[PDB]
Symmetry: C2
Subunit: 183 residues, 2 copies
C-alpha cells in the first residue's frame, strides 16, 4: 500500500461527559442561548457553545455529550465552559467531569478512485448498496470502526475513539483492498 | 435557500443493461482488457474496459451492469464497446440493448459545516448512527434518493438517476435544513 496519498482529517469528536451533578435542565437552559427543552422531543437540551463551536446534549443526570467538536481541546474547553456556567447558576459537582471520547469521525482520501461495485464484489467484509447508502461500508473489527469508501477515493472513518485507530482502520482497508488487488 | 455554494459533482453512474442475448462468459472473458472472473463467488465477469475506464459486470443472461462510469457517454460507449466485442465472437443481438441508468452518485458540498448530532436531533427524518455509519442519511421520497451529510458539509447524493433529481434532492435537504434553522 502507498500511504503517501492517504489523508485522514478529524472531522468531528463526540465525547461522553459526566459532570456528576444532577441538573435542572430548565435552569441549564438559561446558560444555553436559544436552547429549548422539550423532553418529549429529546430528554436533554442542546446547549450550543459558540467558543468552542460545540453543542452539548445535556442530560438531567449531569451526563452530557460534547458534539460538533473538531478537537480534544474543544471538548475540554466545552466541558469547562459548561461547568463554569453551571456553577454560575449554583451547580456543585460531586466529582471531576469524566470526559471520554465517544467517537471520532475522520474524512479522508485513500489516494485513488475506486469502482465501488468491484470493491464490493471483491472485498470480503464490506457492505454496498448505493441506492440505499452511498459508498462501500468497511467495518473494521480491531479497532471497531467503519470506513465509508467512495468511488472518489474519499473515505469517512467513524467508530474509532482515536486517530491512531482510525488510521489503522484505514490501513486495514487499504491492506484488504491491496490483498484483493484493488489498489 | 442559498444554492450558490452547493457544489454537486457526478461521482458514478451505474447502468443496468440487457444485451438481450445470452453470453457464454467463458468466451466473453477474452473480450475484456482485464476481467475478474470467479464464477464461484460472483457469476458475472468483472469486465474492466480501459476506455471508457468502466467495469461491466457481464452476466451470461446478457444483462450487464456498467459500473464505475462518470458519464452517460461512458456508459453508452462501454455497452456499445462490449456489444461490438460480443458481435466479434458471433454474438448476434435480436433486440436493442436496453440501457437504464440505475443510480447516480454525486459528491458535493452544501457549503456549511454541520453538527450532525444536532442535525440528527433536529431533522424530522434522517438517520444518524455514527458508530455504525458516518454522516447523516437524509432520504428523499421524491425523487427517491439518499443524501449522506457530513459535518464538513460534504454530501454524497445517491439513488437519483438524474443530475436534476440529485440537485433537487440536495435542494430538499437544504430546504429542510433551512426549515429547521440548521442553515
Amino acid at each position: 500500500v502507498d500511504m503517501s496519498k492517504v489523508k485522514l482529517r478529524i472531522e468531528n469528536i463526540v465525547a461522553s461527559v459526566d459532570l456528576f451533578a444532577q441538573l435542572d435542565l430548565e435552569k441549564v437552559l438559561d446558560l444555553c442561548p436559544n436552547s429549548k427543552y422539550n423532553p418529549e422531543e429529546f430528554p436533554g437540551i442542546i446547549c450550543h457553545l459558540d467558543d468552542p463551536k460545540v453543542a452539548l446534549l445535556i442530560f438531567s443526570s449531569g451526563k452530557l455529550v460534547v458534539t460538533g467538536a473538531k478537537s480534544v481541546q474543544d471538548i475540554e474547553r466545552a466541558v469547562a465552559k459548561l461547568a463554569q456556567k453551571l456553577k454560575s447558576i449554583g451547580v456543585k459537582f460531586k466529582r471531576a467531569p469524566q470526559i471520554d471520547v465517544q467517537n471520532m469521525v475522520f474524512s479522508g482520501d485513500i489516494g485513488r478512485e475506486f469502482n465501488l461495485d468491484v470493491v464490493a464484489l471483491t472485498l470480503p467484509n464490506c457492505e454496498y448498496e448505493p441506492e440505499q447508502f452511498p459508498g462501500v461500508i468497511y467495518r473494521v473489527k480491531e479497532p471497531k470502526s467503519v470506513i465509508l469508501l467512495f468511488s472518489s477515493g474519499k473515505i469517512v472513518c467513524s467508530g474509532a475513539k482515536s486517530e491512531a485507530d482510525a488510521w489503522e482502520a484505514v490501513r486495514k482497508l487499504l491492506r484488504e483492498l491491496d490483498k484483493y488487488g484493488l489498489l
